[PDB]
Design a protein that fits this description.
Chain lengths: ~170, ~550, ~30
């Protein structure tokens, strides 16, 4: 009886555990797939790229927001974005649809998020570090940037804009 | 009391529990206001009239996170995972150390509480540099957490004493849980201890000019993942070893319970890059490795789901239930000590499902830093862990105090746990759904009422949740105080055995139990895993540090 | 057989799968 129930419980549990293992492995394989596709461009470059937050608004590629979008390939643009308390520059960021965009984002103050609504771009922005992510916008129009990392009392109203031109 | 003279460990257990439940009460006061906020309703004017020291949404959210997720959970873990192994062994914890751990927790709490309450550390419970809190917040918090190093020593002492009396016996179950749990915690804790000692403390004292935010986050999340398993495991020890008795059955496998705990000791710590999928300067291959090991740490709860479900089914069958659902209705739905963890386990189904999504690397970009995250973790800690601790009021309290629970108090406990549960379920729906709509977490969104028009529908669930949980919390406060301040005392209640389950009869795999009992070994494995998972990344970060100045933006 | 424990793990599996595959669809839609 208790002997019986015990044997049956462990038998089926071994089955569930194999099944649950299988399912986790399928997820692993489905994740590896994403990593091989263009959708993995939003994963940050793993690369340490150190900058100085106290001079980033005075010298170097973030110091002139109207020149922040730079053609770096025949179908590629690099955008130097500053996330700061409490906004983004340039504003708007203007890019052509269907080009590959390399965003290089940093902060002069505290950590901010950089979440482009409607896309998988969703990256933390650390002072002293450059976050590099890539994305190709397929649809023209206006996309909102939301700050999703608490950065102080201006956080809830910290937004920016990307304009993707036809 | 002659009971406290023989079992002084009941009194120190009581002090941990009561302090913990007081923190839960105070931190939870902000919860309804935050839920209304996520429902686009701004009730902060009211909150500030009532509590005039609250200067902002964010100061209330710092208090809520620290008090509920850090202070309450730790105090409960120190109560349960010292007292239960001591009762199973029938041995006295070193009482000098027990008391010292309490006073450290109490003192650390009081010291951190001062800048928190004075608006001098509105940096949230993650305190990410360069946001720069008052030195007393970091010092109070450091001393609060180091309290647990004393607990670890307490339980390893219990275990060693017992093993010396009983060479060649395997570790008793509850003790084996608590030993692997506290050793896991020791390894886990070193991330934050390092972040504190090497960076946060000297910085907030003015000794260094900045802190590298990436190294501080990396060391934070070394600890911040396993801290969640540190919250969870004391509820699991009850669910495995006490709940089956309360349900009217037996634990169906002692070896499966040990195996889950052993997987937590090996897998709880080397996984924290799953909090850093959106972080720069960590290599993607390392993110993928932590993602894979995160999916593995899911295995012990997947195993727990079956061991525990089968135990509950067993109890329901003992009690006359038949069919495929009759076992559910036969369970003791009139007992709050039974009902609270069971409801928390039901919410843990969608809770764990969200966690497996979050763990999935690229999938994390859909939900990271959005309302989904709080949606997931309120199912896990604010529902499962918290409800399991609330249900403990109904067997643990009487056991510690001799205070009886009346019929009326039992019924009010049922109402509290039901409303708390349903409130968490309703709010989980509104936050998961708002997060899928890109609503950010940690945001006073009611102050930008036109920013989130698409979220109008989940917002109504958040408002409803906020009201349901306000009512649950108020009933909880009333209830906790009624049993606490209650007139009668029956010392026989303080002297009755804890309601530990029996384990079902059948063998039981001794080869496996003996292998699992090689605790020195498994501990070295867990440690090597952490060196392998974190070493290479941390050697690169520490050799390229870039400290940056601190900011106060509140 | 532990039919009730199997029902529970069934509900759990379906929930994991709806969550995971749902978010996986969202991910590609925003890709
Ligand atoms: C106690 C609290 C916690 C639990 C437990 C927990 C579990 C997991 N989480 Fe998590 N979590 C993450 C992944 C997971 C995974 C893989 C799991 C797993 O361990 C889950 C495994 C569990 C299951 C597979 C469920 C098993 C089902 C059971 C055991 C119930 C069975 C039912 C029964 C027996 C009842 C039947 C009876 C009847 C009557 C029918 C990730 C990333 O991978 C993030 C970062 C996301 C981001 O972008 O920031 C995250 C964020 C958090 C945060 C936010 C931290 C912050 O402030 O930034 C907290 C507080 C938290 C808490 C908790 N989390 N989580
Ligand atoms: C009356 C019950 C409570 C309700 C209504 C509630 C509501 C809230 C809401 C709506 C949020 C999201 C706020 C934001 O992102 O800006 C939040 C954050 C939080 N909650 Fe709760 N809460 C409750 C109880 C719990 C308890 C019991 C736990 C832990 C045991 C807890 C831990 C947390 C923490 C860890 C956060 C995140 C803090 C941060 O991001 O800095 N909550 N809660
Ligand atoms: C989800 C499926 C998980 C349960 C998988 C059930 C596997 C079948 C099993 O283990 O059955 C052995 C038992 O002895 C039968 O006679
Ligand atoms: C019995 C053993 C058979 C078990 C096989 C498991 C099937 C699961 C996933 C395959 C992954 C498909 C990978 C293709 C992904 C493409 C995609 O999602 O397009 C966007
Ligand atoms: C519990 C119930 C769960 C209910 C879940 C609702 C999930 C909804 C949406 C995710 C879809 C995201 C799709 C991304 C496209 C949005 C878009 O295209 O927007 C901006 C762009 O600027 C245009 O120019
Ligand atoms: C409780 C633990 C509290 C930690 C406080 C002090 C510990 C020792 C700190 C020693 C401080 C050295 C600071 C230093 O060397 O600063 C380097 C300077 O930034 C380069 O020019
Ligand atoms: C032991 C109690 C207090 C340590 C006092 C530490 C005092 C450090 C004060 C420095 C400070 O506040 O610097 C800004
Ligand atoms: C235990 C399991 C340990 C081993 C598990 C598998 C890790 C293997 C390869 C990671 C490859 C990831 C490469 C992703 C780079 C994405 C990219 O190119 O970003 C744009
Ligand atoms: C937005 C979602 C909000 C809704 C949230 C609900 C989610 C599931 C709710 C309750 C589960 C209860 C399942 C089992 C309840 C059993 C009680 C029972 O069977 O009672 C028998 C009778 O009392 C003889 O003892
Ligand atoms: C249409 C849906 C409407 C939205 C829900 C509104 C919220 C709460 C109602 C109150 C629920 C209170 C449930 C108490 C159950 C209880 O106490 O049950 C004891 C029971 O006999 C077994 O444990
Ligand atoms: C679980 C218990 C039931 C929960 C919520 C009721 C459902 C409320 C959904 C009604 C939407 C109300 C709303 O805000 O309307 C949408 C928008 O305004 C259109 O113009
Ligand atoms: C007997 C107790 C059970 C009663 C519980 C009801 C059960 C669920 C339904 C509705 C409650 C909704 C409460 C939400 C309150 C107002 C919603 C709101 O703020 O409306 C915004 C609107 O969508 C744009 O202006
Ligand atoms: C304990 C569980 C408590 C459940 C409480 C349900 C909240 C009331 C809903 C009725 C609708 C009242 C909304 C009327 C005005 C809404 C508005 O104007 O906002
Ligand atoms: C007395 C407790 C403090 C002991 C110091 C380390 C002991 C330990 O690390 O535990 C491994 C286990 O003892 C393997 O025998
Ligand atoms: C208890 C708490 C319960 C929380 C409920 C959240 C439930 C499931 C997540 C499923 C993800 C939903 C995604 C649907 C959107 C979809 O299918 O995506 C294709 C569309 O094109 C996209 O833009
Ligand atoms: Cu910038 Cu929040
Ligand atoms: O934290 O999961
Ligand atoms: Cu984690």
């Amino acid at each position: 009886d208790e002997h019986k129930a015990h044997k049956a419980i462990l038998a089926y549990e071994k089955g569930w555990l194999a099944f649950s293992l299988a399912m986790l492995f399928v997820f692993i394989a489905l994740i590896a797939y994403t990593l091989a596709t263009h959708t993995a461009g939003v994963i940050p470059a793993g690369k340490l790229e150190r900058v100085d937050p106290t001079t980033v608004r005075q010298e170097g590629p973030w110091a002139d927001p109207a020149q922040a979008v730079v053609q770096t390939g025949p179908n590629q643009y690099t955008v130097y974005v500053l996330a700061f308390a409490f906004g983004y520059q340039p504003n708007p960021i203007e890019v052509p649809q269907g080009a590959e965009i390399v965003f290089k984002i940093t902060s002069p103050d505290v950590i901010h998020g950089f979440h482009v609504e409607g896309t998988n771009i969703n990256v933390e922005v650390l002072p002293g570090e450059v976050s590099t992510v890539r994305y190709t916008f397929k649809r023209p129009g206006e996309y909102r940037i939301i700050c999703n990392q608490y950065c102080g009392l201006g956080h809830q109203n910290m937004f920016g804009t990307i304009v993707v031109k036809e | 009391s002659r009971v406290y003279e023989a079992y002084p460990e009941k009194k120190a257990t009581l002090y941990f529990l009561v302090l913990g439940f007081l923190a839960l009460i105070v931190g939870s006061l902000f919860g309804p206001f935050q839920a209304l906020n996520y429902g686009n309703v701004d009730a902060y004017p009211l909150l500030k009239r009532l509590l005039p020291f609250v200067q902002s949404y964010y100061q209330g959210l710092t208090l809520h996170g620290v008090l509920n997720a850090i202070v309450f959970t730790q105090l409960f873990a120190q109560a349960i995972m010292v007292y239960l192994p001591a009762r199973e062994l029938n041995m006295r914890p070193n009482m000098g150390l027990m008391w010292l751990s309490w006073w450290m927790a109490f003192i650390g709490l009081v010291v951190f509480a001062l800048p928190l309450l004075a608006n001098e550390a509105t940096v949230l419970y993650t305190f990410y540099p360069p946001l720069k809190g008052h030195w007393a917040f970091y010092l109070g918090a450091s001393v609060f957490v180091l309290s647990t190093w004393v607990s670890i020593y307490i339980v390893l002492d219990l275990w060693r004493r017992w093993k010396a009396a009983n060479p060649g016996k395997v570790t008793p179950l509850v003790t084996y849980m608590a030993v692997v749990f506290w050793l896991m915690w020791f390894l886990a804790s070193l991330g934050l201890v390092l972040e504190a000692v090497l960076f946060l403390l000297p910085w907030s004292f003015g000794l260094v000019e900045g802190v590298d935010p990436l190294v501080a986050r990396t060391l934070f999340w070394w600890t911040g993942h396993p801290i969640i398993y540190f919250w969870l495991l004391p509820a699991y020890a009850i669910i495995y070893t006490i709940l089956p008795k309360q349900a009217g059955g037996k634990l169906v496998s002692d070896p499966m319970a040990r195996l889950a705990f052993l997987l937590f000791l090996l897998l709880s710590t080397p996984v924290g890059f799953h909090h850093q999928f959106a972080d720069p300067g960590i290599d993607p291959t390392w993110k993928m490795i932590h993602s894979v090991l995160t999916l593995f740490v899911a295995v012990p709860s997947l195993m727990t789901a079956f061991t525990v479900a089968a135990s509950l089914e067993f109890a329901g069958r003992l009690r006359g239930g038949r069919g495929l659902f009759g076992w559910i209705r036969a369970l003791p739905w009139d007992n709050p000590a039974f009902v609270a963890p069971v409801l928390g386990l039901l919410g843990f189904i969608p809770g764990g499902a969200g966690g497996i999504v979050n763990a999935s690397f690229t999938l994390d970009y859909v939900v990271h830093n959005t309302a989904w995250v709080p949606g997931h973790f309120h199912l896990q800690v604010a529902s499962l862990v918290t409800l399991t601790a609330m249900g403990s009021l109904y067997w643990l309290l009487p056991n510690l105090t001799g205070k009886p629970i009346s019929d009326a108090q039992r019924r009010l406990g049922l109402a509290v746990v039901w409303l708390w549960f349903l409130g968490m379920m309703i709010m989980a729906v509104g936050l998961h759904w708002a997060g899928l709509l890109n609503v950010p977490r940690r945001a006073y969104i009611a102050q930008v009422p036109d920013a989130y028009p698409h979220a109008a529908v989940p917002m109504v669930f958040n408002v409803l949740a906020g009201i349901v949980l306000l009512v649950a919390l108020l009933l909880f406060i009333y209830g906790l105080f009624s049993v606490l301040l209650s007139r009668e005392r029956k010392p026989e209640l303080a002297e009755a055995p804890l309601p530990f389950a029996e384990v079902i009869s059948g063998p039981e795999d001794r080869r496996l139990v003996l292998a699992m009992d090689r605790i020195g070994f498994w501990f070295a494995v867990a440690a090597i895993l952490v060196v392998l998972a974190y070493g290479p990344t941390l050697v690169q970060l520490f050799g390229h540090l870039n400290p940056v100045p601190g900011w106060r933006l509140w | 057989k532990p039919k009730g424990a199997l029902a529970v793990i069934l509900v759990l599996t379906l929930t994991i799968l709806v969550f995971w595959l749902g978010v996986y669809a969202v991910f590609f839609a925003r890709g």
